[PDB]
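One-letter codes give the sequence; each number marks local geometry. A record appears below:


***
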Amino acid sequence: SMSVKKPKRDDSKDLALCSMILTEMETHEDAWPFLLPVNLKLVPGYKKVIKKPMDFSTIREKLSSGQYPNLETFALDVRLVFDNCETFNEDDSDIGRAGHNMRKYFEKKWTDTFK
């Protein structure tokens, strides 16, 4: 509350660290469904079904241009990638498995870096 602050967590290395995590996800072999925005002209359903599209390239632009206020908002866009994947793909498909793998991969790096 007013004039009563929790001790200050050092957040000066967050930007750098999220960029590292993002690079590691960009270079994973199961990143391919996620590298670029889904073509809304060529994939029936995607536009109407998926209210907030997200992909790694879009995350990378936002991070590089100060569009993440904190590490929580960045983690949200990353999860959104995989939640969208689950909404639109069967678990038993190459893309559905990629999404599950990439989520697991992310959540470990997140925990190992920040918790």
Summary: Residues 94-114 form the longest helix (21 residues). The radius of gyration is 16 Å. The chain has one domain: 1-115. Helices lie at 14-26, 46-49, 56-64, 71-88, 94-114.
